[PDB]
Amino acid sequence: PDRLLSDYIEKEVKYLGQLTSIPGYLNPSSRTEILHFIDNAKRAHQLPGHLTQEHDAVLSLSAYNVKLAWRDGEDIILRVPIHDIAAVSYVRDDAAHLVVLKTAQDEACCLVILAAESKVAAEELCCLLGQVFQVVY
Amino acid sequence: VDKVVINPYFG
């Protein structure tokens, strides 16, 4: 594609939550670190343990930003400009195909914790986000 | 990690 400037793409995801005050030196290539902060967030109940459909969101992707919105009321959960996105990582937990966005903060950073419906979906999200990273200059 | 894509223009 290259309709990232003039149009938007929507994908199926689950929104687990947003982790804040995470060390800015976090390596998005590191499974152990990301899972460290995620597991810690789960023990503190800042993230849900298992995925229901109450966590069903639409991810709208464009050259301007990444937008997440609930499926119920479609109220906007968060809006992250592409230049505020440091990276996107696919972490495969057992049943959860986690897609984690390392983003800037509104030097610490934020981890947007998402869950794709499958492996190919997560890899697709990472590819699309890569293309978006590239079309913006 | 299974897959990682870096934004080379971050910041």
Curated annotation (Swiss-Prot), chain A:
Cellular location(s): Cytoplasm
Transmembrane segment boundaries: none
All copies of domain PID, residue ranges: 5-137
Superkingdom assignment: Eukaryota
Coiled coil: none
Family: Belongs to the CCM2 family.
Function: Component of the CCM signaling pathway which is a crucial regulator of heart and vessel formation and integrity. May act through the stabilization of endothelial cell junctions. May function as a scaffold protein for MAP2K3-MAP3K3 signaling. Seems to play a major role in the modulation of MAP3K3-dependent p38 activation induced by hyperosmotic shock.
Domain remarks in the Swiss-Prot or TrEMBL record: The C-terminal region constitutes an independently folded domain that has structural similarity with the USH1C (harmonin) N-terminus, despite very low sequence similarity.
Subunit structure: Part of a complex with MAP2K3, MAP3K3 and RAC1. Binds RAC1 directly and independently of its nucleotide-bound state. Interacts with HEG1 and KRIT1; KRIT1 greatly facilitates the interaction with HEG1. Interacts with PDCD10.
Disease involvement: Cerebral cavernous malformations 2: A form of cerebral cavernous malformations, a congenital vascular anomaly of the central nervous system that can result in hemorrhagic stroke, seizures, recurrent headaches, and focal neurologic deficits. The lesions are characterized by grossly enlarged blood vessels consisting of a single layer of endothelium and without any intervening neural tissue, ranging in diameter from a few millimeters to several centimeters. CCM2 inheritance is autosomal dominant.
Record-given protein name: Cerebral cavernous malformations 2 protein
Organism of origin: Homo sapiens
Gene that this polypeptide is encoded by: CCM2
Parent sequence residues shown: 55 to 221 of 444
